[PDB]
């Protein structure tokens, strides 16, 4: 599925495809967002990381399973 | 309905279509707002998530039912 | 009448036709500004809803009756 | 007289034509200012209101009276 | 001589002619910068009347006399 | 592999091909960030030297191994 | 020799000859910066006068004597 | 070797030939962002003069000797 994260005060939109589930994805990101943890580490199906800054996230789009 | 919910300093307004009602939407928003929640959730029609990060949200436009 | 709404660090202009009087939207708007709310509700004369974040806002013209 | 006023991180310049003085005007805005005030509020001479947030103003250009 | 204001974040650079003198500009500007004052009042030629947010103040070039 | 940087608030966006593992470069990035450090250093595989202030970083996409 | 002054949120780049040497305006500026001054000082070889809100500033180069 | 330096919300990037070695402007560059210095100070090998804001750097790119 397609995740799409925008990066405020950043003109990409980071966009990859995730071999987990919607939940293991929003568990990760909501918690990122809920402790203000500093450091979000996504993964892709290829193992691509993206490493983003939790405070500079403006939103995460999980698409359909 | 549509849901258009504006961020600030980024280009994208995120649009969708809610299965939800207006109140329902309407709750969800106005609480995260109210309460500087570090996020909002909200889930379309076809099971996509948005997860908001409350502080980057300029506004909610929330559309006639239907 | 008209309500324009310009938001801070925001493309999009804020505009609809309301069914209230200059009057309503006003105090609605100052007493959002006044008290730092963090939310403003304002309803057009169709029934869709903005939201918006009270610190977000940089002005609101409100048109002639 | 014309009045502009421009607004930090907004595309958009207020322009609008005032009914009152040079003087008045200087006065609601000078107050805001110095005060911090959470609202500015403007008439023009139609009687379009424009409510400003104080903190997000830039300027304010007052234009020669008449 | 033509004096030029620089606000930042915001797209215009007002640029007015002084009746004054350097000094005098100099004199209103540097207070405001120096004290903080959340007001700037410069007046033109033609008495038009720029209220600037000292704290949004870029930077001012006064020209020659 | 390819590391791209993403820095607020910055037209560009770093790129350069690291001789390290993609566990090294995460380690050094995770730990900038985690500690808020007031620089992160990384070097690319031809010795150019990129020093980041850690605050200003968006994102850090790490490539896969090879 | 030329004096240019980059300013955080703004598209123009100051710059002006002066008619002073690379280490009287390296003063004034390092003063400037390492004090936090609330203003920057600074006149061209014609006499424009240049006040610059210091903590707006990015960065100067000063050029070259001549 | 090129210094190339970018800074936060300033369109310019900083390009400059440095007489120094990679070794002597990472320390320069290390020690001002380590200790919030408030003023970096940089030479080219034509003898220009960088002063930049500290705060305001967002990163820099040391070229190959």
Redesign the interface.
């Known amino acids: 599925m397609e995740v799409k994260?925008?990066?405020?005060?950043?003109?990409?939109?980071?966009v990859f495809s995730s071999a987990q589930t919607?939940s293991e994805v929003?568990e990760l990101?909501?918690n990122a967002?809920?402790?203000?943890s500093?450091?979000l580490?996504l993964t892709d199906e290829?193992?691509?990381?993206?490493?983003?800054?939790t405070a500079?996230?403006?939103?995460?789009?999980?698409?359909?399973?």
Chains 1, 3, 5, 8 share one sequence.
Not at 33 to 36: E, M, T, V, Y
Not at 46 to 53: A, D, P, Q, T, Y
Not at 56 to 62: C, G, L, N, P
Request: aromatic share 6%.
């Open positions: 994260i925008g990066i405020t005060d950043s003109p990409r939109e980071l919607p929003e990101v909501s967002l809920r402790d203000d500093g450091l580490t290829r193992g691509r990381r993206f490493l983003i800054h500079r996230i403006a939103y995460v789009e999980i698409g359909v399973a």
